[PDB]
Amino acid sequence: HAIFQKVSVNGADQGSLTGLRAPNNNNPVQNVNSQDMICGQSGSTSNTIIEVKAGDRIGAWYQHVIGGAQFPNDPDNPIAKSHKGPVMAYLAKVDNAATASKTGLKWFKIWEDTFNPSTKTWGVDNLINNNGWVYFNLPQCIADGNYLLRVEVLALHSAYSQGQAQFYQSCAQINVSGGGSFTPASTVSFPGAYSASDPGILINIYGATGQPDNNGQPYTAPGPAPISC
Ligand SMILES: [Cu+2]
């Protein structure tokens, strides 16, 4: 239970909900066929389009509720420790990031922090240790212009049952300058890219003594591999 609700650009805080299409509650999306998978449940929208340069260091901030912790010493801020899983980021090129319909876009993955089997560390573990932030660079080669930037937490604490993996998604509206001429060889659809039977979605992450360590096995994130310039 958490909401992606703020972006930073090379460390500069763009402000709460600035440029975001974000849900207004922290409940998960669980039906991978839902249009809610694209940018989360329909919630707040913003007219701002965040100016970024290709290659920039982007931060995406999750907190338990809109605005931060739900109450003093909230143990589930930025997200409950139990919610082990990967974090993924995708781009979709759009003409106008403020007015584009979220439906039917052509998505490609640019980054993910999944599971390190030898350290037993999930992307959500790093999110927690970075106080809700996940950091990644925009590719240096992507073309100039508007994009939606979709960031997604996949929490697997209940994912051993069909349709009970939990998704926490929002989209940021950005304009890229200083880019290159990259065109993705392949794109995917949301909804569509994920199937409930995917081995990173229908998964029992619990080991011998009940710890969520994936039995020290490698984990396969759903969707396509991140592009590289
Ligand atoms: Cu939760």
From TrEMBL:
Disulfides per UniProt: C39-C171, C141-C229
Binding site for Cu(2+) 1: H1, H83
Major localisation: secreted
Catalytic activity: [(1->4)-beta-D-glucosyl]n+m + reduced acceptor + O2 = 4-dehydro-beta-D-glucosyl-[(1->4)-beta-D-glucosyl]n-1 + [(1->4)-beta-D-glucosyl]m + acceptor + H2O
A Pfam family that the UniProt record links to this protein: AA9
Entry's localization field: Secreted
Binding site for Cu(2+) 2: H1, H83, Y168
Domain Auxiliary Activity family 9 catalytic as annotated: residue spans: 1-207
Keyword terms, alphabetized: Carbohydrate metabolism, Cellulose degradation, Copper, Disulfide bond, Hydrolase, Metal-binding, Monooxygenase, Oxidoreductase, Polysaccharide degradation, Secreted, Signal
Entry's Gene Ontology cellular component terms: extracellular region
Cofactor(s) required for function per UniProt: Cu(2+)
InterPro entries xref list: AA9, AA9_LPMO
Biological process according to GO: cellulose catabolic process
CDD domains reported for this sequence: LPMO_AA9
GO molecular function, a single term: metal ion binding
EC number from the UniProt entry: 1.14.99.56
Family: Belongs to the polysaccharide monooxygenase AA9 family.
Name under which the protein is recorded: lytic cellulose monooxygenase (C4-dehydrogenating)
